[PDB]
Amino acid sequence: GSDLAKLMQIAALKGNEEVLDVATGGGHVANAFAPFVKKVVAFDLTEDILKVARAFIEGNGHQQVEYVQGDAEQMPFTDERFHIVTCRIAAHHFPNPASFVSEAYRVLKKGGQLLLVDNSAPENDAFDVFYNYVEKERDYSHHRAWKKSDWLKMLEEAGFELEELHCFHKTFIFEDWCDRMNVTTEKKQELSDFIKSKPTEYYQKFKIVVEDGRVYSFRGESILMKARKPT
Length: 231
Prior knowledge:
Blueprint: H1 4-11, E1 18-22, H2 28-33, E2 39-44, H3 47-59, E3 65-69, E4 82-88, H4 97-107, E5 108-120, H5 125-138, H6 148-158, E6 161-173, H7 174-180, H8 185-196, H9 200-205, E7 209-211, E8 214-228
Parallel strand pairs: 1-2, 1-4, 2-3, 4-5
Antiparallel strand pairs: 5-8, 6-8, 7-8
PDB class: transferase
Keywords: putative methyltransferase, structural genomics, joint center for structural genomics, jcsg, protein structure initiative, PSI, transferase
Assembly: monomeric
């Protein structure tokens, strides 16, 4: 799975790093990196978010984390400050993720790395559009899960050199997945009904399981990219 352990392994940490965790959210990435690096900046849009991240991170005894508010994107850091920028399961909320990518490039040291983890859309446009429509019905704040090719273009355009791209698939349990976003029973019925009526190709693509007329599970893709800012 695209888990934290896999991220940590791919990171190939040296122990001296200053890390920026973009859209830290519940703080899990900063939490994981903290013991193995010099310093972490946990960065997100509001104080409420940073309070929650801090409760979790300080709960595990990590004390070299600095909490900083702002926008991914338009980041209030100096050029060439970080060895690592991380961003996990967050970029699909960004309204202008190309700006986050260029800002990540800017605030990285030369030879530094971006580690980016997110859900991804198929190259096939119909499946792309469908996957994303479904994501947004379930989470109104979803902007876009981009194609792997979209990310390759954004990274190159910003000057990053991709080193590694790892792809993963996960089976989502529809009811649980919905309930994490507090979707109404009515909205869950509507979304299941919408998915269930799609033709066979869609069920085959997303390994859709229907039990007793309701969507039970489907399978999505995610990625982990390690991209270098050149020396």
